[PDB]
Ligand binder design. Sequence first.
Ligand code: HEM
Length: 94
Amino acid sequence: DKDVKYYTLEEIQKHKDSKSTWVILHHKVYDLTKFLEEHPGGEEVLREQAGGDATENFEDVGHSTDARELSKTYIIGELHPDDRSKIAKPSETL
Ligand code: HEM
Protein backbone atom coordinates (compact mmCIF):
# COMPACT_ATOMS: atom_id res chain seq x y z
CA ASP A 1 0.00 0.00 0.00
CA LYS A 2 1.16 3.58 -0.41
CA ASP A 3 1.42 7.24 0.49
CA VAL A 4 2.09 10.36 -1.56
CA LYS A 5 5.84 11.16 -1.63
CA TYR A 6 5.84 14.90 -2.33
CA TYR A 7 9.45 15.68 -3.46
CA THR A 8 10.96 19.08 -4.41
CA LEU A 9 12.31 19.94 -7.89
CA GLU A 10 15.78 20.13 -6.28
CA GLU A 11 15.60 16.59 -4.83
CA ILE A 12 14.53 15.19 -8.20
CA GLN A 13 17.34 17.08 -9.92
CA LYS A 14 19.71 14.78 -7.93
CA HIS A 15 18.78 11.41 -9.33
CA LYS A 16 19.07 10.52 -12.99
CA ASP A 17 20.63 7.12 -13.62
CA SER A 18 20.40 3.69 -12.14
CA LYS A 19 16.72 2.73 -12.49
CA SER A 20 15.50 6.20 -11.36
CA THR A 21 14.43 8.59 -14.14
CA TRP A 22 11.86 10.88 -12.50
CA VAL A 23 10.74 13.93 -14.49
CA ILE A 24 8.77 17.15 -14.18
CA LEU A 25 6.59 17.02 -17.24
CA HIS A 26 3.72 19.53 -16.60
CA HIS A 27 4.52 20.22 -12.95
CA LYS A 28 4.38 16.68 -11.51
CA VAL A 29 6.91 14.06 -10.44
CA TYR A 30 6.52 11.31 -13.01
CA ASP A 31 8.46 8.04 -12.60
CA LEU A 32 9.79 6.87 -15.95
CA THR A 33 11.88 4.05 -14.39
CA LYS A 34 8.83 1.81 -14.87
CA PHE A 35 8.54 2.95 -18.48
CA LEU A 36 12.38 2.55 -18.93
CA GLU A 37 11.27 -1.11 -19.39
CA GLU A 38 7.96 -0.45 -21.28
CA HIS A 39 7.77 2.91 -23.19
CA PRO A 40 7.52 2.56 -27.01
CA GLY A 41 10.43 3.95 -29.07
CA GLY A 42 13.16 3.66 -26.42
CA GLU A 43 14.20 4.23 -22.78
CA GLU A 44 17.61 5.87 -23.40
CA VAL A 45 15.74 9.00 -24.55
CA LEU A 46 13.72 8.91 -21.30
CA ARG A 47 16.87 8.63 -19.20
CA GLU A 48 18.80 11.33 -21.18
CA GLN A 49 16.93 14.20 -19.53
CA ALA A 50 15.54 12.42 -16.43
CA GLY A 51 15.84 14.70 -13.35
CA GLY A 52 15.87 17.94 -15.36
CA ASP A 53 12.85 19.25 -17.33
CA ALA A 54 11.93 16.83 -20.14
CA THR A 55 8.79 18.86 -21.06
CA GLU A 56 9.40 21.09 -24.09
CA ASN A 57 11.25 18.40 -26.06
CA PHE A 58 8.61 15.79 -25.11
CA GLU A 59 5.81 18.09 -26.37
CA ASP A 60 7.84 18.95 -29.50
CA VAL A 61 7.70 15.22 -30.37
CA GLY A 62 3.88 15.53 -29.95
CA HIS A 63 3.23 13.86 -26.59
CA SER A 64 -0.33 15.09 -26.29
CA THR A 65 -3.54 13.06 -26.23
CA ASP A 66 -3.25 9.44 -24.90
CA ALA A 67 0.41 9.69 -23.77
CA ARG A 68 -0.39 13.01 -22.00
CA GLU A 69 -3.16 11.31 -19.99
CA LEU A 70 -0.95 8.22 -19.42
CA SER A 71 1.68 10.69 -18.06
CA LYS A 72 -0.63 11.07 -15.06
CA THR A 73 -0.39 7.28 -14.40
CA TYR A 74 3.38 7.66 -13.70
CA ILE A 75 2.42 9.80 -10.69
CA ILE A 76 4.43 8.33 -7.79
CA GLY A 77 4.56 11.37 -5.50
CA GLU A 78 3.97 14.72 -7.31
CA LEU A 79 5.99 17.88 -6.63
CA HIS A 80 6.32 19.29 -3.16
CA PRO A 81 3.14 21.42 -2.71
CA ASP A 82 5.55 24.35 -2.02
CA ASP A 83 7.23 24.50 -5.50
CA ARG A 84 3.92 23.40 -7.01
CA SER A 85 1.98 26.31 -5.44
CA LYS A 86 4.39 28.73 -7.18
CA ILE A 87 4.67 26.70 -10.41
CA ALA A 88 5.18 29.53 -12.90
CA LYS A 89 3.08 29.28 -16.07
CA PRO A 90 5.65 27.37 -18.19
CA SER A 91 4.95 27.85 -21.89
CA GLU A 92 3.34 26.28 -24.70
CA THR A 93 1.90 24.33 -26.57
CA LEU A 94 1.84 21.12 -28.62
C1 HEM B 1 5.56 10.14 -18.90
C2 HEM B 1 5.33 10.61 -20.14
C3 HEM B 1 5.47 9.70 -21.34
C4 HEM B 1 4.45 8.96 -21.88
C5 HEM B 1 3.15 8.63 -21.20
C6 HEM B 1 4.88 8.58 -23.21
C7 HEM B 1 4.10 7.86 -24.11
C8 HEM B 1 4.48 7.62 -25.43
C9 HEM B 1 3.64 6.97 -26.41
C10 HEM B 1 2.26 6.39 -26.20
C11 HEM B 1 4.32 6.98 -27.60
C12 HEM B 1 3.73 6.61 -28.94
C13 HEM B 1 2.91 7.75 -29.55
C14 HEM B 1 2.19 7.34 -30.83
O1 HEM B 1 2.36 6.17 -31.23
O2 HEM B 1 1.46 8.20 -31.36
C15 HEM B 1 5.63 7.54 -27.35
C16 HEM B 1 6.65 7.65 -28.31
C17 HEM B 1 7.89 8.26 -28.08
N1 HEM B 1 8.32 8.89 -26.96
FE1 HEM B 1 7.23 8.99 -25.18
N2 HEM B 1 6.14 9.11 -23.41
C18 HEM B 1 6.54 9.79 -22.29
C19 HEM B 1 7.70 10.52 -22.08
C20 HEM B 1 8.70 10.67 -23.04
C21 HEM B 1 9.89 11.46 -22.85
C22 HEM B 1 10.31 12.18 -21.59
C23 HEM B 1 10.58 11.41 -24.04
C24 HEM B 1 11.89 12.11 -24.29
C25 HEM B 1 11.94 13.46 -24.35
C26 HEM B 1 9.87 10.56 -24.97
C27 HEM B 1 10.29 10.27 -26.28
C28 HEM B 1 9.56 9.45 -27.16
C29 HEM B 1 9.97 9.08 -28.50
C30 HEM B 1 11.25 9.49 -29.19
C31 HEM B 1 8.97 8.30 -29.03
C32 HEM B 1 8.99 7.56 -30.35
C33 HEM B 1 8.37 8.35 -31.50
C34 HEM B 1 8.07 7.42 -32.67
O3 HEM B 1 7.19 6.55 -32.48
O4 HEM B 1 8.76 7.56 -33.70
N3 HEM B 1 8.74 10.15 -24.32
N4 HEM B 1 5.65 7.96 -26.05
